[PDB]
């Protein structure tokens, strides 16, 4: 029938498709289904790391203020990640979701000042706009182009009320003064599962351009673009909820027949 | 393997319902020994087929499947043709014809369109049935909407035939998708399932189809209201709680 290598591919796929705040439940389901603990360890190792980086998992490093996000941008290889604010690498346990062994690390310094200016501006932006949001800002050269990558995460987990949600946004500013090219994606996932399984999956792509000057005045323009676009997206989502509700949804089924009463089943059967 | 089935059904409650069909196919590849149990207990979006004899659409699901063929409630034949597929008894088939006509009127009154199908099967001391309704908005609207109703009723008959016990397990799947400038891609989809049971008198003034009709109508009205609350209320409040 199905090869072991295919089975564990599927197992790994499911693990990576766990909704926010429900990683352990999916993992335990997949474990019992595969019923081959030594196969699962081999073929789905990557899955835990992939999930954590995809979901912008926030982690606390003891001794440092706020939290850092686990993302593809911070992956240093061999289970270590960059915290570009505190200029350290740390070891990340993808099962326990725990950071350890902080060590000094610097990566590139063309963008040290720009990254710090952007980080400072974005931190205030995130704390003001999200109830418990976190951000991480990276500066790196990509194809000879200096790039600031800003990542934002915010989640709310209420599994005892059968729901969880997460917002992620990732903003890239490719800096070629006096212009910066802007590319972003905003993503939302909400899961409600009391007697059912209902999910919102949403994303929006953003492209923009901004004229740049000094690091601080530029960081300010970047946060203004972020704020306008994220506010716009949130506004539009709520407007779309309204349109869906009183157009499409109402069109799918009436609340009652035109009679404004329930059916007379005796007239039906005649 | 009750444990395995419980894990598989838990996974279906958690994996994104936008991939509900691939989720089921992948699960069956992961645990092939569960195939029959999964095809029975994992609801899927309803598909439409044409009954060529009558020029009428009918709905496909595991409950009208035998081998790789499906039975029409209009012609009572399998397509593709089958030797000796599962069939309702003669008397149950008459009830099934009557139920199909009643539910087509119900569908018209509530959905003003779409497609319905009813499939019954014999049990040892009664019968069971599924009432299926599919309604899709125009797919040319880039603002897609689809509704699937799956109502499974078990009827345990008593020696007299003057009372029966009815157990109803109902799923509604509701799928909405939009791709717009302001809100980007939004896909809001999935399903809710609820269950209820009741004893009812069975008589010429209250026959089985009336008793089942009322239970289905009460449940579907309740589920419509809950969908409204969860889709357009709860999930929206959660989004706004994130930012």
């Amino acid at each position: 029938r199905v090869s072991d290598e295919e089975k564990v591919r599927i197992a790994a796929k499911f693990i990576t498709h766990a909704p926010p705040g429900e990683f352990n439940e999916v993992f335990n389901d997949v474990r019992l289904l595969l019923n081959n603990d030594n196969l699962l360890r081999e073929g789905a190792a990557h899955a835990f790391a992939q999930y954590n980086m995809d979901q912008f998992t926030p982690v606390k490093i003891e001794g440092y203020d706020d939290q850092v996000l686990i993302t593809e941008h911070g992956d240093l290889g061999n289970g270590r990640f960059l915290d570009p604010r505190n200029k350290i690498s740390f070891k990340f346990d993808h099962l326990r979701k725990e950071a350890s062994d902080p060590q000094p690390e610097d990566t590139e310094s063309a963008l040290k000042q720009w990254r710090d200016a952007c980080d400072s501006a974005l931190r205030a932006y995130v704390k003001d706009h999200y109830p418990n949001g976190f951000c991480t800002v990276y500066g790196k050269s990509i194809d000879g182009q200096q790039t600031i990558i800003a990542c934002i995460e915010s989640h709310q987990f209420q599994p005892k009320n059968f729901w969880n949600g997460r917002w992620r946004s990732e903003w890239k500013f490719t800096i070629t003064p006096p212009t910066a090219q802007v590319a972003a994606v905003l993503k939302i996932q909400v899961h409600y599962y009391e007697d059912g399984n209902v999910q919102l999956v949403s994303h929006k792509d953003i492209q923009d351009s901004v004229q740049v000057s000094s690091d601080v005045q530029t960081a300010k323009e970047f946060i203004k673009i972020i704020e306008n676009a994220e506010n716009e997206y949130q506004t539009a989502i709520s407007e779309n909820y309204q349109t869906m509700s009183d157009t499409t949804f109402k069109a799918l089924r009436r609340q009652l027949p035109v009679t404004r009463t329930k059916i007379d089943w005796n007239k039906i059967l005649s | 393997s009750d444990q395995q089935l419980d894990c598989a059904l838990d996974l279906m409650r958690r994996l994104p319902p936008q991939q509900i069909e691939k989720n089921l196919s992948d699960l069956i590849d992961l645990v092939p020994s569960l195939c029959e149990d999964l095809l029975s207990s994992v609801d899927q979006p309803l598909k439409i087929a044409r009954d060529k004899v009558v020029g009428k659409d009918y709905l496909l699901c595991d409950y009208n499947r035998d081998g790789d063929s499906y039975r029409s409630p209009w012609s009572n034949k399998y397509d593709p043709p089958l030797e000796d597929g599962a069939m309702p008894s003669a008397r149950l088939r008459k009830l099934e014809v009557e139920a199909n006509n009643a539910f087509d009127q119900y569908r018209d009154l509530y959905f003003e369109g779409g497609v319905s199908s009813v499939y019954l099967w014999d049990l040892d001391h009664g019968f069971a049935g599924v009432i299926l309704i599919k309604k899709a908005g125009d797919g040319s609207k880039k603002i897609k909407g689809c509704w699937d109703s799956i109502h499974v009723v078990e009827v345990q008959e008593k020696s007299s035939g003057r009372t029966a016990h009815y157990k109803l397990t109902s799923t509604v799947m509701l799928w909405l998708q939009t791709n717009k400038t302001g809100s980007g891609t939004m896909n809001l989809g999935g399903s809710l399932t609820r269950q209820m049971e009741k004893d009812e008198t069975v008589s010429d003034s209250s026959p089985h189809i009336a008793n089942i009709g009322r239970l289905v109508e009460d449940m579907e009205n309740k589920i419509r209201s809950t969908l409204n609350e969860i889709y357009f209320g709860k999930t929206k409040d959660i989004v706004n709680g994130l930012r």
């Binding site: 439940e25 599962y193 007697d195 | 089935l5 419980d6 059904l9 838990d10 409650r13 195939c35 029959e36 095809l39 029975s40 207990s41 994992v42 609801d43 595991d62 409950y63 499947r65 035998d66 081998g67 790789d68 089958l82 000796d84 597929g85 599962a86 099967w121 049990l123 069971a128 499974v152 078990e154 157990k167 397990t169 799923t171 399932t193 609820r194 269950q195």
Partner: peptide
């Protein structure tokens, strides 16, 4: 933790499993 209502729906016996 979650209740699975569809587990208790009456089984319909088929002549042939899928091929």
């Amino acid at each position: 933790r979650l209740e699975h209502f569809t587990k208790l729906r009456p089984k319909r016996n088929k002549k042939q499993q899928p091929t």
